[PDB]
Design a protein around this ligand. Structure first.
Ligand code: 4M5
Length: 259
C-alpha cells in the first residue's frame, strides 16, 4: 500500500529533523542569503584566528582535530537516527553495530554535501564558513583530504534533494544487506526493500518532473564507497607521518577492519 509508504516516509523525516541539529534547508538558507543567519567566513589564517571571538598547535592539525570532533558528533546523531528506523533496533546487536560502522562514513559524506557549495563547508553548526581553497592550502598530507568530498558534493547537489528525500535515502544506506560479517541478511534486506519502496514513492511525488531520479540517486552510492576507500588510505598515512596525533576511539573502531 502506497499510504503505508507515505506514513513511513513521514516517520523517517520526523526522526531526521529531531536527530540532526543542522538540516539542508537551514544550511542552504544560510548559504543562499535568505541577515542573522549569515556566517563568518575563514579564507586565511587571520580569518581563522579572528573566528574564535565571533564563534564558539599546528593550524592544519587544529583543523583536523576539529573535523574529528565533528565526525564523532555526526556518528552520535546518525546513531540516534538509526534507532528511529523501524526494525533496526530489533535486529541482532552485532548486526546493528556492523551496519552502523559501514553506514556512518557514507552517511556523513552525504550529509556533508548539504552544507557544501563549490566554495565551502559550513562549520560550527552553520555559524562559520570555511573556504575550499583554504582547506586545500593546508600542508601535506593534510591539504588533499577535503577535496574528494567537494567533488561529490557538487555532483550530488545537482540532484537537489530535499531533507525528506535525504532521510529515506540514508535509512537505505544504513540498512544494507551487503555489509561484511553480517550474521543475518534476510531480516535486513526486507527492511531495505521497504525503505527503497518509500524512496521510490517519495522521489516520484517530490520530483515528478525529474526522470529516473531514484536510479540516479542509487548510482551515487558507488561514488560514496569510492570516497570511503580514499579516506581510509589518507587516514592511515596521517597516523604514520604524525605519530604525535591521537585518534578518537569511536572513529578508530569504525575505520578498523574495513573491507
Ligand atoms: C572533516 C569534518 C568537517 C569538515 C568541515 C570543516 C572543517 C572541520 C572542522 C572545523 C570546525 C568545526 C566544523 C564542524 C562543526 O563544529 O559543526 C571531514 C571528515 O569527515 C574527517 C573525518 C575524519 C578525520 C579525523
Amino acid at each position: 500500500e502506497s499510504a503505508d509508504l507515505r506514513a513511513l516516509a513521514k516517520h523517517l523525516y520526523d526522526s531526521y529533523i529531531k536527530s540532526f541539529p543542522l538540516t539542508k534547508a537551514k544550511a542552504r538558507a544560510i548559504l543562499t542569503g535568505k541577515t542573522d543567519k549569515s556566517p563568518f567566513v575563514i579564507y586565511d589564517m587571520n580569518s581563522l584566528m579572528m573566528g574564535e571571538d565571533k564563534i564558539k598547535k599546528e593550524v592544519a592539525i587544529r583543523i583536523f582535530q576539529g573535523c574529528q570532533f565533528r565526525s564523532v558528533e555526526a556518528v552520535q546523531e546518525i546513531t540516534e537516527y538509526a534507532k528511529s528506523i523501524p526494525g533496526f533496533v530489533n535486529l541482532d546487536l552485532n548486526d546493528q553495530v556492523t551496519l552502523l560502522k559501514y553506514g556512518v562514513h557514507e552517511i556523513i559524506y552525504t550529509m556533508l554535501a548539504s552544507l557544501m557549495n563549490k566554495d565551502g563547508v559550513l562549520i560550527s553548526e552553520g555559524q562559520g564558513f570555511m573556504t575550499r581553497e583554504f582547506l586545500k592550502s593546508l600542508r601535506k598530507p593534510f591539504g588533499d583530504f577535503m577535496e574528494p568530498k567537494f567533488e561529490f558534493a557538487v555532483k550530488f547537489n545537482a540532484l537537489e534533494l530535499d531533507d525528506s528525500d535525504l532521510a529515506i535515502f540514508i535509512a537505505v544506506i544504513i540498512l544494507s544487506g551487503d555489509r561484511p560479517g553480517l550474521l543475518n541478511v534476510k531480516p535486513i534486506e526486507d527492511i531495505q526493500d521497504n525503505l527503497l519502496q518509500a524512496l521510490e514513492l517519495q522521489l516520484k511525488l517530490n520530483h515528478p518532473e525529474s526522470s529516473q531520479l531514484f536510479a540516479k540517486l542509487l548510482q551515487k552510492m558507488t561514488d560514496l564507497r569510492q570516497i570511503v576507500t580514499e579516506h581510509v588510505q589518507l587516514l592511515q598515512v596521517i597516523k604514520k607521518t604524525e605519530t604525535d596525533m591521537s585518534l578518537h576511539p569511536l572513529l578508530q573502531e569504525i575505520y578498523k577492519d574495513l573491507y
